[PDB]
Amino acid sequence: SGGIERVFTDKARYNPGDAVSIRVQAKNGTGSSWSGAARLEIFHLENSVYTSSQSLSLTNGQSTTLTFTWTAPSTDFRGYFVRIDAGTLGQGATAIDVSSDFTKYPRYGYISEFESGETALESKAKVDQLAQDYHINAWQFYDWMWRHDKMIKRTGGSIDSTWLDLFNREISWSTLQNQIDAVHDVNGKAMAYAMIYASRENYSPLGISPTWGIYEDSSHTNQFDVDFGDGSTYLYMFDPQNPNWQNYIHAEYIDSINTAGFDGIHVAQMGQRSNVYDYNGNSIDLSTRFSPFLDQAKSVLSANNPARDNLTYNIVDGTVNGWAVNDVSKNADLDFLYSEIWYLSDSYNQLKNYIEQLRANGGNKAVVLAAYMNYADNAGTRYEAESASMTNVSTNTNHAGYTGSGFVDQFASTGDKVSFAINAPEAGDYSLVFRYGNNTGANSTLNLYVDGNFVQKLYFFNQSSWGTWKHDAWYQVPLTQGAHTVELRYESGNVGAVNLDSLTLGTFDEHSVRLADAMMSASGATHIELGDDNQMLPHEYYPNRSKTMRSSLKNAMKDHYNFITAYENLLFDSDVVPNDTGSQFVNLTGVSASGDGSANTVWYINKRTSDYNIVHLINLLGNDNQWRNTASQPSFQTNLPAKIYIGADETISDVYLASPDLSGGETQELAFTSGTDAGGKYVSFTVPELKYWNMIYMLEH
Ligand SMILES: OC[C@H]1O[C@H](OC[C@H]2O[C@H](OC[C@H]3O[C@H](OC[C@H]4O[C@H](OC[C@H]5O[C@H](OC[C@H]6O[C@H](OC[C@H]7O[C@@H](O)[C@H](O)[C@@H](O)[C@@H]7O)[C@H](O)[C@@H](O)[C@@H]6O)[C@H](O)[C@@H](O)[C@@H]5O)[C@H](O)[C@@H](O)[C@@H]4O)[C@H](O)[C@@H](O)[C@@H]3O)[C@H](O)[C@@H](O)[C@@H]2O)[C@H](O)[C@@H](O)[C@@H]1O
Ligand SMILES: OC[C@H]1O[C@H](OC[C@H]2O[C@H](OC[C@H]3O[C@H](OC[C@H]4O[C@H](O)[C@H](O)[C@@H](O)[C@@H]4O)[C@H](O)[C@@H](O)[C@@H]3O)[C@H](O)[C@@H](O)[C@@H]2O)[C@H](O)[C@@H](O)[C@@H]1O
Ligand SMILES: [Ca+2]
Ligand code: NA
């Protein structure tokens, strides 16, 4: 299908009645002149709702961009699938969301970089790329602010043109305003990251009072804090129910909306803290104190500007009945729910049950998860340090836990070097990740050279023994396709020493990422995972680029995001509920099945709306039951016979199967038969292909 290179729209979301411009980028590479038609067809679920055609002739090697126009139908909150057929030139797909309000079907991305060198054109391109490729309709702006308690830096009444954030990055006001403008141009919303309860160090000259603080004891001796490890930089924590702190920080939220032009506030927190006291020594349960803060915040935001009053709150460490889970999801006036998952919902099934709880508690508000894929894994192509070209250092095996046949030791003085000969299979960004040991008692440093040029000085953190390997020393660089040299040098001005195990081209595992996203969306949530210039999120610190997506995963993500936009009505509507009572059952011939996301099975998940019986098949054949870690390619299946049991209450008019894995998400209608036996009333068919994820939607009269 390689002639049709891109299919996309001008915006990420449309109001009913809007003109939608569908673009088709085509290039003739058949080796000789081509003449024919490009045929557009738009579907809402199983139903075709628009078709149109344009003739197309291209000389060998010739490219062009067609435009089809369409008016968004008048029914609000509907997703559409888009097919482009150009015959022998190939085909393509995209999707369209018609929604007056993104908080119904949020597709959340992020921006975390605000360099002054970034032009308005480049800011537009990075927003356009996410909007066009994935229909991202909201961006979380991460670490834009000057201080947590003084977000826009001013000299007198004048906004400073740049400022340094808490890690000393330079934030450009003009770059930030350009990005916000670009987001608004695609009908996106810009959400400002802000803490619920943080000031920075030395807060009293800003008129903030310790008497508004939360404390670790009843004598106001130690205020809860966050220690960034340099002996100066901290956050201090405050009581979200305190009316003075609310006054203070809600005014900063408002300033951010009105001055910077944000469309809402993404309210963050640090997560569970125990045995909390106010300044006067009253014992308080912090977990029930967010909801009153958030209700009040929503009130002043909505009063200030009903169009820029969006609000969510991070439920940190999400799990069924987790800390603050019930109080927030049930009582807080939020537009959608957001939760960062750590280690309390490690299996696919646990995480499914948590999403389900959030959906039920919130009255089927939208749910977005932050769930950093491959977080603990040194995923990617590995080059063993002991197999590299090393100067004035030699190999060893005398501390356990190394990969390969050993590691490089005593990397500790001027003239020492290790040079890796790597290959980039495609042009693009590469995360260069070093697994190392350092027990010198302080940070150690080395200079990084790529193809003979100095790129950065890198820091290698002190660990607690020499048998303690880490892989948090990394740097991302652009590489051309083919051979390169990556070199670490101990030069003048470097300090300490390291053991070096390996270099890895830090890469998100395509397989795990597809399974996790399928699981989440089939359960009823989306996933904040894409941001900046086509980065995927590796870590809670969003500017982290310790892993990169390769092209094969970028395509799978385009398909996935096309799929969750096109079928948003079947995945995320307030209609959509679990179909969990009745002993409902799926039988697959030749493969192990399971209803609870067991290892090495095809998982079925049962959902429904008033019109459809929906069955998701998620293919864990050949893989474990953990969602975050790396995975192998699933055992793909062909012509899989299936039979789905249904309440005798139900009669099924049609069987439809759509998958982001198959023909871009396009629905196929399947022939099926009904019957009855010992197991109850059933329907039966052949699934032609299961790779990662199939959604079966079956129409009921
Ligand atoms: O995402 C929140 C939180 O999630 C996980 O921890 C949850 C657990 O917390 C408690 O147990 C862990 C540990 O927590 C404390 O110390 C943590 C950490 O503190 C210092 O480093 C802080 C971070 O510094 C970098 O991040 C910079 C950003 O800091 C702030 O943002 C934090 C996050 O807010 C989230 O809401 C959001 O989703 C996320 O994107 C943000 O990154 C700030 O607002 C931003 O402006 C900054 O950019 C660094 O990159 C992070 O890794 C650090 O967390 C110290 O230097 C570091 O050494 C500490 O580990 C307690 O002090 C400690 O006692 C406790 O053991 C709680 O007990 C558990 O129940 C709960 O599950 C992550 O593991 C954690 O890292 C993260 O902050
Ligand atoms: O005590 C103050 C000094 O401590 C820090 O430097 C510590 C060492 O760093 C490098 O060596 C790294 C090396 O460390 C261990 O090796 C221990 C011994 O092993 C052999 O006996 C060897 O012959 C000796 O050199 C060494 O003492 C780990 O087991 C090994 O895997 C590591 O690679 C330097 O090369 C050493 O000279 C240091 O002792 C601190 O950074 C220094 O500034 C301080 O002087
Ligand atoms: Ca090794
Ligand atoms: Na897994």
From Swiss-Prot:
Optimum pH is 5.5. Transmembrane segments: none annotated. It comes from the Bacteria. The keyword Metal-binding does not apply. GO terms for molecular function: carbohydrate binding; glycosyltransferase activity. Monomer. This is Cycloisomaltooligosaccharide glucanotransferase. It comes from Niallia circulans (Bacillus circulans). The chain holds residues 41 to 738 of 972 of the full protein.
